[PDB]
Amino acid sequence: AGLADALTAPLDHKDKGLQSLTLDQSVRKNEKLKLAAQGAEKTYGNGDSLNTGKLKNDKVSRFDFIRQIEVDGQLITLESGEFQVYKQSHSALTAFQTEQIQDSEHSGKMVAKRQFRIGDIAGEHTSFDKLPEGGRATYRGTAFGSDDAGGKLTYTIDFAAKQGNGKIEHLKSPELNVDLAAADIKPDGKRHAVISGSVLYNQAEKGSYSLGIFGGKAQEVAGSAEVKTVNGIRHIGLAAKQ
Predict the structure, then answer these.
(1) Which of 8, 34, 95, 213 could cross-link 84 (Cys pair, CB 3.0–4.6 Å)?
(2) Are residues 119 and 165 in the same domain?
(3) Same domain for 36 and 77?
(4) Distance of CA 205 to the CA centre of its chain
(5) What letter does residue 189 receive in the DSSP assignment?
(6) Residue 148 · residue 171 · CB < 8 Å
């Protein structure tokens, strides 16, 4: 799966999909994120990039992670688990499957805990001002949550109307297979084309979702959804391509 090289090989201009994913949200500013897989290992600071060019496109790549803080020369484990990376050609996102968290009583002591969250969503953000003037685009891809990367994402953008809607299907937990209700393409603060909208389950609003448009020709979409459940918000990574 190219996990070791992703962690240790230099960016190669010849590598496919998105070559480099900037870990901004994945590594907190005063922390370190150590990734391991396949007998390789790399520690990342905020703003370092993961060599996604080594990873397979349209798949979840999995790494053990140890979220760390360096104090007085010592690396103290804050959290550990699985680090997931989904790669497209113009975008990619990361997710954390927490499995352990530093014990509230003795530092150096870990406790078992499972939580799932999206980290970064980045790549070649499409400029709102450079969007196609008309026509539509259909995006087909993946929806992935905790213990489940088997979801189907379908998404349609009408560029003339600057509106998008779509559907999530086949996640094992039934209440995650939500509709991504029609929402407007709007410019970011950086004028990136983004979509923020409601999620529907049986036509009832059950959370929200946000996608960015990626690629110079709006080739891809990526972001996440939040689905309200009796156990809290569940997070679902979203990525699709024309």
Answers:
(1) 95
(2) no
(3) yes
(4) 23
(5) T
(6) yes
User: Which value in Å is the resolution of this experimental model?
Assistant: 2.0
Q: Specify the length of the chain in residues.
A: 242
Query: Taking a C-beta distance cutoff of 8 angstroms, is the pair 223, 211 a contact?
Result: yes
**Contact between residue 231 and residue 222 where contact means Cβ atoms under 8 Å apart:** no
CB atoms within 10 A of CB 140: 15
The experimental method, as deposited, was X-ray
CATH number for position 241: 2.40.160.90
Q: In the chain, after which residues is the C-to-N distance over 2.5 Å, breaking the chain?
A: none
The token pair at 92 is: 């990619």
Q: Exposed (0-12), middle (13-18) or buried (19+): which is 25, by Cβ within 10 Å?
A: middle
Question: Which among 53, 56, 61, 55 is positioned nearest to 13, based on CA atoms?
Answer: 53
Percentages (nearest 5) of helix, strand, coil residues in the chain: 5, 60, 35
> What residues make up the domain containing 53?
1-126
Q: Cα angle at 226 between 221 and 227, to 5 degrees?
A: 125
Q: How open is the CA angle 144-176-149, to the nearest 5 degrees?
A: 20
CATH code, 85: 2.60.40.1980
Distance CA 26, CA 184 (A): 28
Helix (H) or strand (E) holding 4: helix 3-8
Both 181 and 228 in one domain: the answer is: yes
Comparing CA positions, the residue from 188, 134, 125, 180 lying closest to residue 156 is 180
